[PDB]
Write a protein that binds this ligand. Structure first.
Ligand SMILES: Cc1cc([C@@H]2CN(C(=O)c3ccc(F)c(I)c3)CC(F)(F)C2)n2ncnc2n1
Ligand SMILES: [Mg+2]
Ligand SMILES: [Zn+2]
Length: 341
């Protein structure tokens, strides 16, 4: 009944103009996690409208309203992999569209697929990684472990199950070829969110950047969609220091909860998931240096207007070194007690 009332307003009230969400809503400086969660579904509609996807693809408004609410309802509430993560990832896709001239690189249907994939790309996440699915013999590993990217295959399958819910197929008027194309793009883009996939294709991304993007090269389109998806997925790191500090807290809370479950199963967790061994500053610097910084450098190499994103990530990485000393206990604890020994 709650979704029904939310649906009724979303459909009949009208789509708010994107500028009424916030004055800097289309800026790389805007933090979409500042928007109250109760306003995010309308914000999704506003972005789809402002990108002209509703008109261009003649999307049925009742179907779109139901679809957006169903996607939102398809996320659980772990500390990090929740609807506010998917919303902020989608918002960054919108920022790329508004700031980087994607229509000079990608087909319209590819840009639309990227945005919809962003909304769906972590559907039904349980706060555990792919290794945990296999180690815990979960149902998801039973379905997908032979293929790899267990969680990402589940996210895609959940997106399809939403489309296959009566009243929710935003694409059901597409031609057969266009429908097939959209679902194939969603498959490739969602599976691209597995960081292991990113690391496998990284040298191909570098080679594409070095030689120059070729808009007539079908493999270049595919590689660019992967890089853009990853850039949206990691985009919290392109914001201010306070955003990245909070996101670190949410990440480690989720990771350490997984590690607690592994220890209760008799398995030694990954160091980054073991609250007794993980040293957060060192781990964030390693993640920033080896994963996040190279991604935004590739993006800057392909889009010179993305330079500010890379500089922000590098700045945040240097901030971690500046605060590292605070993880050492100087003097006595604030309670004046050594009881923790
Ligand atoms: C925006 C953002 C997203 C993520 C993670 C990265 N991921 C990892 O597997 C991972 C790999 C190597 C590492 F050294 C660490 I630490 C984590 C996957 C994910 F957990 F889904 C989200 N982190 N992690 C730290 N700061 C982040 N900021
Ligand atoms: Mg994911
Ligand atoms: Zn994600």
């Amino acid at each position: 009944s709650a979704m029904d009332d939310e649906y009724t307003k979303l459909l009949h009230d009208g789509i708010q103009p994107v500028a009424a969400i916030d004055s800097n809503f289309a800026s790389f400086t805007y933090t979409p996690r500042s928007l109250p969660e109760d306003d995010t579904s309308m914000a999704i509609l506003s972005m789809l409208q402002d990108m002209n996807f509703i008109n261009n693809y003649k999307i049925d408004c009742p179907t779109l309203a139901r679809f957006c609410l169903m996607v939102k309802k398809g996320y659980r509430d772990p500390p990090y992999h929740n609807w506010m993560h998917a919303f902020s990832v989608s918002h960054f896709c919108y920022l790329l569209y508004k700031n980087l001239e994607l229509t000079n690189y990608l087909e319209d249907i590819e840009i639309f697929a990227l945005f919809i994939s962003c909304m769906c790309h972590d559907l039904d996440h349980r706060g555990t990684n792919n290794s945990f699915q296999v180690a815990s013999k979960s149902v998801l590993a039973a379905l997908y472990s032979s293929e790899g990217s267990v969680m990402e295959r589940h996210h895609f399958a959940q997106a399809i199950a939403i489309l296959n819910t009566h009243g929710c197929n935003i694409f059901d008027h597409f031609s057969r070829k266009d429908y097939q194309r959209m679902l194939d793009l969603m498959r490739d883009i969602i599976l691209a969110t597995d960081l292991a996939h990113h690391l496998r294709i990284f040298k191909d991304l570098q080679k594409m950047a070095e030689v120059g993007y070729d808009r007539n090269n079908k493999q270049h389109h595919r590689l660019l969609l992967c890089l853009l998806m990853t850039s949206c997925d990691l985009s919290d790191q392109t914001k201010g220091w306070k955003t990245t500090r909070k996101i670190a807290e949410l990440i480690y809370k989720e990771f350490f909860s997984q590690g607690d479950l592994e220890k209760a199963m008799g398995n030694r967790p990954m160091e980054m998931m073991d609250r007794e061994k993980a040293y957060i500053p060192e781990l964030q610097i390693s993640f920033m240096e080896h994963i996040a910084m190279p991604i935004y450098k590739l993006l800057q190499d392909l889009f010179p207007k993305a330079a500010e994103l890379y500089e922000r990530v590098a700045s945040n990485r240097e901030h971690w070194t500046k605060v590292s000393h605070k993880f050492t206990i100087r003097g006595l604890p604030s309670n004046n007690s050594l009881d923790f020994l």
